[PDB]
């Protein structure tokens, strides 16, 4: 039980995720305590949304921790795809948070607020500070690439929401501003999250690695030129992690073809293309 | 463009999904039209939630349609894992809908309602009728198994929400009832959705097929008993669809071992275990 905390603190990314998760949960709890007295209609909703984004960050942290585990004869490739699952979950979280922001903006535009306003803006500035700190901490530029990108996009979406509420507060002092700003924030969040979901779905759909896809015809041509190789059939290349490709091949060779040399040459050819793990089945054709 | 509609109507499951999607979107639009006049705070939120569940059903329908497409040298295994992705997305949708129901129940329990009540209950009965019709239509007991289970669980969750609001309405006439009922509905939704997410994550994590896992040691023992097979190493079995298993194997055999016979016997052994697609790499050991 205590080994989890030591492991999380040992890793840099896990430690940063734990720091941000604790900070978000504590600030959500503080907002809940400040809003339990009154103004529940907005503060309770905001606190629950913060707790929900906290759940998304916790999911990313759990995937990051689990990604370092070893094989157990059940997960033959290991838990390495936890990062891809976390990226997909973060993308869905961002889409649904954008839709929630859309709904809240529409509700505010179609309802006059009689609740306290100064407290709402003050805690929103604190949330903006939290989001800016999160952006600063997670600035980047067992494999762990998708999780960092997902959490960074999540922090960007939270920052967009914070700047939206701040700009609405500023413009109201100096009615149309709030819905337009909410729609713009939601659209920006969706457009930003699109590439992450594209990559995660590409990985999760057993698609050919996009980087490897260009060089596959050349590799097939070079394998075909090997002596004794009649044909190449049933080729399947898919992605496991970032820069980790797994490919399966079936070769049909001459009845007396040099199986060892053909196998070694095929492995070299597909290793020069970046396929770390490869399985080649050599079939000896009949005549 | 028009080919999509003909294809959707051709398939039974796609036709049913399109029927339910159109019905849900039309009823959400009707509720929006009825609530545009007044009582926005609850009716607008309910209509947007219906449109959001409509988006989840549309995602399931799109996965069902795409699951029938052919290979294009990019998706080597095809788009067959769209059903698994749809199941995972439906599971996440159910979890987040349960959390939304939790939040709405807490808000209702911590805020006295001054809005119209008779209209809210009447449209809720209509939603319950819609959910019961959906349960009746999708009663069951390119592969398409996860999508049906996901949409069925979604309809079950919507039915649970409808019975919760109806029971709260009945009990209020005859304050504590609403939050307790909301919590119970959310817990039931999460517990119901747990197995679907378990199966979808197991498929998406490149885990060994749970049905095949029991018989793998026996198959390894029977392959080891083959003449000339020194050892069996680097075995990876994962799941592509329902009852579609893909396995990769590496054998180390004698310098003069019968490669053809060993390959045929290994393929027969793993085909009798249900592995439809298998790749065996035979390495000729040096001494």
């Amino acid at each position: 039980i205590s080994g989890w905390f030591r492991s999380i603190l040992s890793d840099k990314t896990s430690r940063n995720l734990f720091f941000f998760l604790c900070l978000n949960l504590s600030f959500a709890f503080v907002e809940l305590l400040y809003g339990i007295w009154s103004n529940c209609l907005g503060l309770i909703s905001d606190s629950f949304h913060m707790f929900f984004d906290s759940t998304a960050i916790l999911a990313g942290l759990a995937a990051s921790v689990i990604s370092k585990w070893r094989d157990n004869d059940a997960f033959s490739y290991g838990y390495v795809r936890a990062e891809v699952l976390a990226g997909f979950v973060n993308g869905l979280f961002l889409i649904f948070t954008a839709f929630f922001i859309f709904s809240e903006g529409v509700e505010r535009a179609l309802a006059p607020p009689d609740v306290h306003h100064e407290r709402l803006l003050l805690v929103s500035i604190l949330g903006f500070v939290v989001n800016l700190i999160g952006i600063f901490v997670f600035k980047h530029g067992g494999p762990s690439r998708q999780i960092l990108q997902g959490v960074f996009l999540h922090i960007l979406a939270d920052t967009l929401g914070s700047i939206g509420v701040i700009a609405s507060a500023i413009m109201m002092q100096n009615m149309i501003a709030d819905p337009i700003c909410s729609i713009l924030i939601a659209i920006l969040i969706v457009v930003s999250v699109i590439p992450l979901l594209r990559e995660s779905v590409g990985i999760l759909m057993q698609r050919t690695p996009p980087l490897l896809e260009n060089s596959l015809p050349q590799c097939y041509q070079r394998v075909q030129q090997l002596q004794g190789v009649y044909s190449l059939q049933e080729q399947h290349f898919w992605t496991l992690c970032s820069d980790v490709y797994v490919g399966t091949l079936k070769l049909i060779v001459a009845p007396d073809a040099d199986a060892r040399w053909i196998l070694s040459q095929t492995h070299n050819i597909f290793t020069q293309a970046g396929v770390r793990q490869l399985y080649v089945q050599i079939d000896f054709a009949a005549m | 463009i028009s080919g999509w509609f003909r294809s959707i109507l051709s398939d039974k499951t796609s036709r049913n999904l399109f029927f339910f999607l159109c019905l849900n979107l039309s009823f959400a639009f009707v509720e929006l039209l009825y609530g545009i006049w007044s009582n926005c705070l609850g009716l607008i939120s309910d209509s947007f939630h219906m449109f959001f569940d409509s988006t989840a059903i549309l995602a399931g329908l799109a996965a069902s349609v795409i699951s029938k497409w052919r290979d294009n040298d990019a998706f080597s295994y095809g788009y067959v894992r769209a059903e698994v992705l749809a199941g995972f997305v439906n599971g996440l949708f159910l979890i987040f809908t349960a959390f939304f129901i939790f939040s709405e129940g807490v808000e209702r329990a911590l805020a006295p309602p001054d809005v119209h009540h008779e209209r809210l209950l009447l449209v809720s009965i209509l939603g319950f009728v819609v959910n019961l019709i959906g349960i009746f239509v999708f009663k069951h007991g390119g592969p398409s198994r996860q999508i049906l289970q996901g949409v069925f669980l979604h309809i079950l969750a919507d039915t649970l929400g409808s019975i919760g609001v109806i029971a709260s309405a009945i009990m209020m006439q005859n304050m504590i009832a609403d939050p307790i009922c909301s919590i119970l509905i959310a817990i039931l939704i999460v517990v119901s959705v747990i197995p679907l997410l378990r199966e979808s994550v197991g498929i998406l994590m490149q885990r060994t097929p749970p049905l095949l896992e029991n018989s793998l040691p026996q198959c390894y023992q029977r392959v080891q008993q083959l003449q000339g097979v020194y050892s069996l190493q680097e075995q990876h079995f994962w799941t592509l669809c329902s009852d579609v298993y893909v396995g990769t194997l590496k054998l180390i055999v004698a310098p003069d071992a019968d490669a053809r016979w060993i390959l045929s016997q290994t393929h027969n052994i793993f085909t009798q275990a249900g592995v439809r697609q298998l790749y065996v790499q035979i390495d000729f050991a040096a001494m």
């Epitope: 009649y230 009845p255 007396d256 040099d258 060892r260 492995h267 054709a285 005549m287 | -």
Partner: antibody
Framework: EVQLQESGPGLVAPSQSLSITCTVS????????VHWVRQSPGKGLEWLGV???????DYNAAFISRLSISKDNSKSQVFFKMNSLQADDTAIYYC????????????WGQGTSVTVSS | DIVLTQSPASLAVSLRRRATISCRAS??????????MHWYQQKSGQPPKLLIY???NLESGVPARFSGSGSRTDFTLTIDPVEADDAATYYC?????????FGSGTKLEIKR
């Protein structure tokens, strides 16, 4: 009892083609590959080409524009044809079957000496 | 292309002493632990006879006195004990890279 017999012209003009027939016995061409190797005093043993069971041919990079290797499974004959013979192409042309599942040539035939002169 | 160099060019050994022929490749001819180097024996006016395939395996029917070793680039053919019938020319062939190449022969002279 495995023999490979070459039958070809000993003397070839310095501008004509060459044709050597390699008649095999004791094994079937349907499951063996026959290589073509020439040996000359000034250049040593050189690998020209090989023809496989299904008819696929692999040629040397420096002879790909001139070689032409055919088969006749029923007659158990392998035909070697080279164009644009020159004074440096005189050698002893051997046809040798490929060792099963290896890149070596276990059985060789006593090739026919070829000279290219006017 | 792979250039195979055999040293020495001419070797003189006694009737029963130890004989060693070395063939060095320009680049490695190894793959997955297999060295694709083959050794041939060509007597006077005869086609070459395969002795060693994959640099360590004796051809079926050859005398046991022939041995092979080496890996990557350096390879060694060992004849022990030598006999009067071993006076021939020995070539090394690599099948690792197209085209197949034969090294310059190593003439063996039996002293008496």
């Amino acid at each position: 009892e495995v023999q490979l017999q070459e039958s070809g012209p000993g003397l070839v003009a310095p501008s004509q083609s060459l044709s050597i027939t390699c008649t095999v016995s004791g094994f079937s061409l349907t499951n063996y590959a026959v290589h073509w190797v020439r040996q000359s005093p000034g250049k040593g043993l050189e690998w020209l080409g090989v023809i496989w069971s299904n008819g696929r041919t692999d040629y040397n990079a420096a002879f790909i524009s001139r070689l032409s290797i055919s088969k006749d499974n029923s007659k158990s004959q392998v035909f070697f044809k080279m164009n644009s013979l020159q004074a440096d192409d005189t050698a002893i042309y051997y046809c040798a079957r490929k060792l099963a599942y290896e890149g070596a040539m276990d059985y060789w035939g006593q090739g026919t000496s070829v000279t290219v002169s006017s | 292309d792979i250039v195979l160099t055999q040293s020495p060019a001419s070797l003189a050994v006694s009737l029963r002493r130890r004989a060693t022929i070395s063939c060095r490749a320009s680049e490695s001819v190894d793959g997955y632990g297999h060295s694709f180097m083959h050794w041939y024996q060509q007597k006077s006016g005869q086609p070459p006879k395969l002795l060693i395939y994959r640099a360590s395996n004796l051809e079926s029917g050859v005398p046991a006195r022939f041995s092979g070793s080496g890996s990557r680039t350096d390879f060694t053919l060992t004849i022990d004990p030598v006999e009067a019938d071993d006076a021939a020319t020995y070539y090394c062939q690599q099948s690792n890279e197209d085209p197949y190449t034969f090294g310059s022969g190593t003439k063996l002279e039996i002293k008496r």
